[PDB]
């Protein structure tokens, strides 16, 4: 069930006295005319969300509703605020109460306090750990629904509990309908009378007339046209564009090489002047060991480097762990040494099917003795491995590829190919053309760009058009529609009907009359 909240849910935002003044404040208020869930207590006490604050109201004739429970689990496992009003004694506790499956009243505590015809409205919000309670009691004569009217709720209690409250439940006296609303960060114009009592309010987002009233800081609007808010079309999706195939890098001939070199005579391949597509490392799940140092593989297709070096060799499983900075052993010290500040990735996979013979593959060698340890990235050119098909996993051959990334004070030719998306025309999008980003409408154009020209600019030096890197067509960039909202109204002494003018826009993005 739902009812009309009308103008309920306005409370004093602070403890400041004001009079004969209209004060504009932004706080968590109940939006005007919003829907609040209507519960009944006749012939129904569910747990409701708390979100960012809850508006509560009830109508009484026999004091059926006597308390509230606020918390997260309500099962003695966490702290839960308990408020009980029995006859003449208001009781507030924050103990870890063990509540029944259906709490009701018949006819490690850190705080304790002891003190239809009646409408009792409440607001419960938690700001930086402070549980603020507002309320107002007024006589009413209405059973069916909430009375219509306006009444401000004064603060009464402020408990610095610091408790994360996400759910709440009501308490009924069994031998009383209640409403639950939610607060939003709306701006309200509050009217303070000569006695400092709030007598009216304007919700600055209910409708264009309320926006006009807030703009003029008045509850009366003179006849005329007022500018109250700027209209701006929002983008719907992003567009990422890179060439389909600019230039790839020969990573295939490094990993899928027919034959590999020994670890002492490790082979180095230089990668320069090509877009580095690392998706062959992501897709290919045929890798046994994949460890990176100094850089992350996910954030690698969007990062440039001056040069990339691909070192490849063959070792056994017990030695794969030695291909890392700060490692020691025959391979690290005598065959292949990585510096302590190495920035790259180490990849290895079991190559027992390729680098093993029935009589033992002895073509892969390794340096056994040396008078000193190798310097980082040193190649000194011996004992033979000789792998067999029945070797243990630690003694089976492994093909290792070590990618190392350097960044010097020189131009970076190796960066990375980022995935492209489809292009959407005649819609407000957030586009990215070869790294140039912006927001605007992409349309077809008749601008004859020269083969070497990629971007266009207007007199103001802003981007006018771009050439699609995949299909050599020229697309115009028109910034997304924007302007202003003006409200055309006769004075509030005659009518509350208004007309809205959206300045310098078409009647598209928004009894509609198109004017210049």
């Amino acid at each position: 069930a739902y009812t009309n909240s009308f103008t309920r849910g306005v409370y004093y935002p602070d403890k400041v006295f004001r009079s004969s003044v209209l004060h504009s404040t932004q706080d968590l208020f109940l939006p005007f005319f919003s829907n609040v869930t209507w519960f009944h207590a006749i012939h129904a006490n569910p747990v409701l969300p708390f979100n960012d604050g809850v508006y509560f109201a009830s109508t009484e004739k026999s004091n059926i509703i006597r308390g509230w429970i606020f918390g997260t689990t309500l099962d003695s496992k966490t702290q839960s605020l308990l408020i009980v009003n029995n006859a003449t004694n208001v009781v507030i506790k924050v103990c870890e109460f063990q509540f029944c499956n259906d709490p009701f009243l018949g006819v490690n505590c850190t705080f304790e306090y002891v003190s239809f015809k009646n409408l009792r409205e409440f607001v419960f919000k938690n700001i930086d750990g402070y549980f603020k309670i507002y309320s107002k009691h007024t006589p009413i004569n209405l059973v069916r629904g909430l009375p219509q009217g306006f009444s401000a709720l004064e603060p009464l209690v402020d408990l610095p509990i610091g408790i994360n409250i996400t759910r709440f439940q009501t308490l009924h006296i069994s031998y009383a309908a209640y409403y639950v609303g939610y607060l939003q960060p709306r701006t309200f114009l509050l009217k303070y009378n000569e006695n400092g009592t709030i007598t009216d309010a304007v919700d600055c987002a209910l409708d264009p007339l309320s926006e006009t009233k807030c703009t003029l800081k008045s509850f009366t609007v003179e006849k005329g046209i007022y500018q109250t808010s700027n209209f701006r079309v929002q983008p719907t999706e992003s567009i990422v564009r890179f060439p389909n195939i600019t230039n790839l890098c020969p990573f295939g001939e490094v990993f899928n090489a027919t034959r590999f070199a020994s670890v002492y005579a490790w082979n180095r391949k230089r990668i320069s002047n090509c877009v580095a597509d690392y998706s062959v490392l992501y897709n290919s799940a045929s890798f046994s060991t994949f460890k990176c140092y100094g850089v992350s593989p996910t954030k690698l297709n969007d990062l440039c480097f001056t040069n990339v070096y691909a070192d490849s060799f063959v070792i056994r499983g017990d030695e794969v762990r030695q291909i890392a900075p700060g490692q020691t052993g025959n391979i690290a010290d005598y065959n292949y040494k990585l510096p302590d500040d190495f920035t790259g990735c180490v990849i290895a996979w079991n190559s027992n099917n390729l680098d093993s013979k029935v009589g033992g593959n002895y073509n892969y060698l390794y340096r056994l003795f040396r008078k000193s340890n190798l310097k980082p990235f040193e190649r000194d050119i011996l004992q033979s491995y000789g792998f067999q098909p029945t070797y243990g996993v630690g003694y089976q051959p492994y093909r290792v590829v070590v990618l190392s990334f350097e960044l010097l004070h020189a131009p970076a030719t190796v960066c990375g190919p980022k995935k492209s998306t489809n292009l959407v025309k005649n819609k407000c999008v957030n586009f990215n053309f070869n790294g140039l980003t912006g927001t605007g409408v992409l349309t077809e154009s008749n601008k004859k760009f020269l083969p070497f020209q990629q971007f266009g600019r207007d007199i103001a030096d802003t981007t006018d058009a771009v050439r699609d890197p995949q299909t050599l067509e020229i697309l115009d960039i028109t910034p997304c529609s924007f302007g202003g909202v003006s409200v055309i109204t006769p004075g509030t002494n005659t009518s509350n009907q208004v007309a809205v003018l959206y300045q310098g826009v078409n009647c598209t993005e928004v009894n509609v009359f198109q004017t210049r």
Partner: antibody
Amino acid sequence: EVQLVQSGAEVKKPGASVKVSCKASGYTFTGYYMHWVRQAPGQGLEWMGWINPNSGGTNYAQKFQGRVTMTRDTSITTGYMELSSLRSDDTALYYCARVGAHDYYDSSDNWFDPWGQGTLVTVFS
Amino acid sequence: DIQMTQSPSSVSASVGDRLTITCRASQGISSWLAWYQQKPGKAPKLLIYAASSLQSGVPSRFSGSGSGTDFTLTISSLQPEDFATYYCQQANSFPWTFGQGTKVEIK
């Protein structure tokens, strides 16, 4: 048959050292690590360290670092565990065990299998 | 280091019973867990590795399950020769560590 056969039980005085041997047969000796695990009166199992018989490298549990030495003699496919400065709570059953590799969990080679029969070392005067 | 907690410490069961033994790791070890059986006077023997893989030659009434921190050794149909102490062991990180063991007795 793959088997690990250990040397016989010994009594050693507190402060002395003991050297237990583990002769391997029936498999490629340099192709598997040899680990040592001991079992004290309260039958808990306690890993001590490993030796790589191919490279000669070792790695010891921090509890025994500075007090244990693991070695091997490939020519007779035997591993050794020497524990020095023996104390009363070093009285235990000492096991050698074969482990194929320390990377891939998914293979049966890469767990303790098989084990030696154990060597009871009693530390007493 | 990774602590392995086994439960129960002891269990008495009848021939033909289904028996479950649990092992909890102090942190995630994926599937890097094994189960060993130690019969009286004998060295431990690998039963289950990689949490759920059956060691060759081991009777299939011994099975394992679990991943992460919680692991279970199951004996689906207890036999008199299953009188033994059972140990879990993690291989995720050195030092490799064992549970305290579960003693199985036969009613």
